Write an enzyme that holds these catalytic residues in place. Structure first.
Site, PDB file in Angstrom:
ATOM      1  N   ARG A  36     -26.528 -37.755  29.640  1.00 20.26           N
ATOM      2  CA  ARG A  36     -26.384 -39.185  30.322  1.00 20.26           C
ATOM      3  C   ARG A  36     -27.468 -39.944  30.651  1.00 20.26           C
ATOM      4  O   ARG A  36     -27.830 -41.134  30.137  1.00 20.26           O
ATOM      5  CB  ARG A  36     -25.261 -39.235  31.770  1.00 20.26           C
TER       6      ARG A  36
ATOM      7  N   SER B 291     -24.085 -26.075  38.040  1.00 16.79           N
ATOM      8  CA  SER B 291     -25.116 -27.247  38.775  1.00 16.79           C
ATOM      9  C   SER B 291     -23.927 -28.119  39.806  1.00 16.79           C
ATOM     10  O   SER B 291     -24.491 -29.159  40.676  1.00 16.79           O
ATOM     11  CB  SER B 291     -25.359 -27.760  37.827  1.00 16.79           C
TER      12      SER B 291
ATOM     13  N   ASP C 282     -23.272 -24.836  23.970  1.00 17.82           N
ATOM     14  CA  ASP C 282     -22.806 -25.165  24.821  1.00 17.82           C
ATOM     15  C   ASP C 282     -21.491 -24.385  25.510  1.00 17.82           C
ATOM     16  O   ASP C 282     -20.844 -25.868  25.836  1.00 17.82           O
ATOM     17  CB  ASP C 282     -23.351 -25.792  25.788  1.00 17.82           C
TER      18      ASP C 282
ATOM     19  N   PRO D   4     -29.657 -27.502  33.153  1.00 16.26           N
ATOM     20  CA  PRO D   4     -29.161 -28.876  33.290  1.00 16.26           C
ATOM     21  C   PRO D   4     -28.256 -29.407  34.633  1.00 16.26           C
ATOM     22  O   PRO D   4     -28.936 -28.332  35.793  1.00 16.26           O
ATOM     23  CB  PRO D   4     -27.519 -28.949  32.810  1.00 16.26           C
ATOM     24  N   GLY D   5     -28.078 -30.159  34.583  1.00 15.74           N
ATOM     25  CA  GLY D   5     -28.355 -30.747  36.100  1.00 15.74           C
ATOM     26  C   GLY D   5     -29.133 -32.178  36.248  1.00 15.74           C
ATOM     27  O   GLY D   5     -29.509 -33.041  37.452  1.00 15.74           O
TER      28      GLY D   5
ATOM     29  N   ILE E 104     -11.730 -12.664  27.103  1.00 20.04           N
ATOM     30  CA  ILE E 104     -11.956 -11.738  26.684  1.00 20.04           C
ATOM     31  C   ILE E 104     -12.675 -11.220  25.364  1.00 20.04           C
ATOM     32  O   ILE E 104     -13.341 -12.302  25.190  1.00 20.04           O
ATOM     33  CB  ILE E 104     -10.480 -11.356  26.605  1.00 20.04           C
ATOM     34  N   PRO E 105     -13.159  -9.967  25.686  1.00 17.38           N
ATOM     35  CA  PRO E 105     -14.134  -9.247  24.788  1.00 17.38           C
ATOM     36  C   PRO E 105     -13.501  -9.787  22.936  1.00 17.38           C
ATOM     37  O   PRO E 105     -15.143 -10.774  22.688  1.00 17.38           O
ATOM     38  CB  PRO E 105     -14.384  -7.932  24.662  1.00 17.38           C
TER      39      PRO E 105
ATOM     40  N   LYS F 188     -20.266 -22.402  27.016  1.00 19.69           N
ATOM     41  CA  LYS F 188     -19.425 -21.755  28.842  1.00 19.69           C
ATOM     42  C   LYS F 188     -18.297 -20.514  27.856  1.00 19.69           C
ATOM     43  O   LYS F 188     -17.421 -20.648  28.629  1.00 19.69           O
ATOM     44  CB  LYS F 188     -18.923 -22.898  29.126  1.00 19.69           C
TER      45      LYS F 188
HETATM   46  O1  LIG Z   1      -6.847 -13.384  30.689  1.00 17.50           O
HETATM   47  C1  LIG Z   1      -6.442 -14.214  29.475  1.00 17.50           C
HETATM   48  C2  LIG Z   1      -5.912 -15.326  29.361  1.00 17.50           C
HETATM   49  C3  LIG Z   1      -6.235 -15.381  27.530  1.00 17.50           C
HETATM   50  N1  LIG Z   1      -5.783 -14.815  26.925  1.00 17.50           N
HETATM   51  C4  LIG Z   1      -5.550 -14.927  26.032  1.00 17.50           C
HETATM   52  O2  LIG Z   1      -4.285 -14.879  25.404  1.00 17.50           O
HETATM   53  C5  LIG Z   1      -4.576 -13.935  23.836  1.00 17.50           C
HETATM   54  C6  LIG Z   1      -3.867 -12.168  23.889  1.00 17.50           C
HETATM   55  O3  LIG Z   1      -3.639 -12.156  22.093  1.00 17.50           O
HETATM   56  P1  LIG Z   1      -3.859 -10.552  22.033  1.00 17.50           P
HETATM   57  O4  LIG Z   1      -4.063  -9.349  22.964  1.00 17.50           O
HETATM   58  O5  LIG Z   1      -2.353 -10.467  22.365  1.00 17.50           O
HETATM   59  O6  LIG Z   1      -3.594 -10.688  21.038  1.00 17.50           O
HETATM   60  C7  LIG Z   1      -5.996 -14.570  23.395  1.00 17.50           C
HETATM   61  O7  LIG Z   1      -5.695 -15.638  22.625  1.00 17.50           O
HETATM   62  C8  LIG Z   1      -6.764 -14.538  24.301  1.00 17.50           C
HETATM   63  O8  LIG Z   1      -7.977 -15.408  24.259  1.00 17.50           O
HETATM   64  C9  LIG Z   1      -6.722 -13.308  27.649  1.00 17.50           C
HETATM   65  O9  LIG Z   1      -6.040 -12.560  26.574  1.00 17.50           O
HETATM   66  N2  LIG Z   1      -6.502 -12.817  28.452  1.00 17.50           N
HETATM   67  O1  LIG Z   2     -23.730 -25.435  35.244  1.00 14.57           O
HETATM   68  C1  LIG Z   2     -23.745 -26.826  34.142  1.00 14.57           C
HETATM   69  C2  LIG Z   2     -23.698 -26.080  32.368  1.00 14.57           C
HETATM   70  C3  LIG Z   2     -23.596 -27.069  31.420  1.00 14.57           C
HETATM   71  N1  LIG Z   2     -23.875 -28.537  31.799  1.00 14.57           N
HETATM   72  C4  LIG Z   2     -24.440 -29.129  30.544  1.00 14.57           C
HETATM   73  O2  LIG Z   2     -24.737 -29.804  30.875  1.00 14.57           O
HETATM   74  C5  LIG Z   2     -24.844 -30.644  30.302  1.00 14.57           C
HETATM   75  C6  LIG Z   2     -25.119 -31.607  31.427  1.00 14.57           C
HETATM   76  O3  LIG Z   2     -25.280 -32.919  30.996  1.00 14.57           O
HETATM   77  P1  LIG Z   2     -25.966 -34.487  31.822  1.00 14.57           P
HETATM   78  O4  LIG Z   2     -25.438 -34.157  33.312  1.00 14.57           O
HETATM   79  O5  LIG Z   2     -27.083 -34.284  32.382  1.00 14.57           O
HETATM   80  O6  LIG Z   2     -25.737 -36.170  31.440  1.00 14.57           O
HETATM   81  C7  LIG Z   2     -23.612 -30.830  29.657  1.00 14.57           C
HETATM   82  O7  LIG Z   2     -23.562 -31.175  28.489  1.00 14.57           O
HETATM   83  C8  LIG Z   2     -22.653 -30.416  30.843  1.00 14.57           C
HETATM   84  O8  LIG Z   2     -22.032 -29.633  30.121  1.00 14.57           O
HETATM   85  C9  LIG Z   2     -23.942 -28.639  33.177  1.00 14.57           C
HETATM   86  O9  LIG Z   2     -23.947 -29.692  33.368  1.00 14.57           O
HETATM   87  N2  LIG Z   2     -23.532 -27.866  34.187  1.00 14.57           N
END
Ligand SMILES: O=c1ccn([C@@H]2O[C@H](COP(=O)(O)O)[C@@H](O)[C@H]2O)c(=O)[nH]1
Ligand SMILES: O=c1ccn([C@@H]2O[C@H](COP(=O)(O)O)[C@@H](O)[C@H]2O)c(=O)[nH]1
EC number: 4.1.1.23
Lengths: 219, 219
Positions: free
Chosen positions: A196, A120, A63, A173-174, A69-70, A65
């Site tokens: 939890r 959530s 998880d 979750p939630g 960027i791509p 999340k």
């Molecule tokens: O909107 C965003 C936020 C963060 N980064 C981060 O900044 C760096 C850009 O790297 P580069 O495109 O110069 O190689 C990477 O670590 C990337 O994950 C972005 O590129 N765009």
């Molecule tokens: O929308 C979301 C997406 C992921 N989680 C994840 O699900 C788990 C929920 O845990 P708990 O609330 O049951 O302790 C955590 O790992 C949390 O990061 C959420 O709670 N809400």
């Protein structure tokens, strides 16, 4: 689709290796699917994923999340699947190209992407909720078949199910700590995620058994 | 605000420890601030932060784009600061409670939060862009002092600067590989983030020296 034992996924967000393994062991008879996130991974390292597979054999959902960027998303997914995760959770909010990057690596390594559409927590209402139906539609267009939506808003969870269809896989979750009900959530989701309510319980095994007892007719 | 040498932040997204260490060492005379993200951390462990500290006189920004519920955000931030990061980057799109959670931990632990408002990649136009002005305004109301906005959209970066004011600190990725120009970006951003343009060059030191030469009148 993924076959989750007892429709119950453990969110293992303890941050100590000894505790995480012990608690997971305590509830192992009830689950075969563990969701591991950054609280554990950043505390103990990505090597923890292989340790879970060695000790329990459970499938592992990372998880993370993913919300970069791509190009960076591809690197994150690659590192995550290399560590032994079966699936990764990806944010939909950063757009189609970012999701596609994850789908690419998942296809190459034979793993699964779960698309998180609406979160959530209360703050999800500010920006995510208004985009959520469109994010789910985007998922469908991209051929995503696994989704995550909020136990805390069963009407929004139901809408997510509507959009993706009965064939898609949906986890939620939630449940427990955040206020969601196990049985109501399983009206729409294939499986519930519980952290939890289990891992902070004085007796995690009994906690897991109690949840499963409450949903017996849904198993 | 942090005093970023040469207004240039290295995005160290190499995934091999030996390579990451070599390249960062090669450019150390030009840069005192390194942004570390999940590609390196998930590959080599959070211990990489300490190792960079040991080897280089560099402050560390953890670009973890924190995007979870408030309680989990707290844990992520705690783990990240424990590992020695000076600052962490947090997504604004999950809402105010999620951001506030990170701010609270940063205050307690004496470290800094950077709020990511609009992203630099094309997909950012789908959902993030339409929310970005409000995400920024939310940051301001929460007392956020440090921000991240896109080099790839000068008009958007300019608007972000307006919203946060001249006193706020603004760093901007998307320079080089993604198409953004160092000089134009520095019209609004305090510092530029550069990854591939430096770390993939035959001579990273020359690439960094070249970027700095091109913005010499801005230093
Ligand atoms: O909107 C965003 C936020 C963060 N980064 C981060 O900044 C760096 C850009 O790297 P580069 O495109 O110069 O190689 C990477 O670590 C990337 O994950 C972005 O590129 N765009
Ligand atoms: O929308 C979301 C997406 C992921 N989680 C994840 O699900 C788990 C929920 O845990 P708990 O609330 O049951 O302790 C955590 O790992 C949390 O990061 C959420 O709670 N809400």
């Amino acid at each position: 689709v993924m076959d989750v034992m007892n429709r119950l996924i453990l969110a293992m967000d303890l941050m100590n290796r000894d505790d995480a393994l012990r608690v997971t062991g305590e509830v192992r008879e009830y689950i075969d699917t563990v969701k591991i996130g950054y609280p554990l991974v950043l505390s103990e390292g990505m090597d923890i994923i292989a340790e879970f597979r060695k000790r329990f054999g459970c499938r592992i959902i990372a998880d993370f999340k993913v919300a970069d960027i791509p190009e960076t998303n591809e690197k994150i997914c690659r590192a995550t699947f290399k560590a032994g995760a079966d699936a990764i959770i990806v944010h939909g909010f950063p757009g189609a190209d970012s999701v596609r990057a994850c789908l690419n690596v998942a296809e190459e390594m034979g793993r699964e992407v779960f698309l998180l559409t609406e979160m959530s927590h209360p703050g999800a209402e500010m920006f995510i909720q208004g985009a959520a139906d469109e994010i789910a539609r985007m998922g469908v267009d991209l051929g995503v078949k696994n989704y995550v939506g909020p136990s805390t808003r069963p009407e929004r969870l139901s809408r997510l199910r509507e959009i993706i269809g009965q064939d898609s896989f949906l986890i939620s979750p939630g449940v427990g700590a955040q206020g969601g009900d196990p049985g109501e959530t399983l009206r729409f989701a294939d499986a519930i995620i519980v952290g939890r309510s289990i891992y902070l319980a004085d007796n995690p095994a009994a906690a897991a058994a109690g949840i499963i007892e409450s949903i017996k007719d849904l198993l």
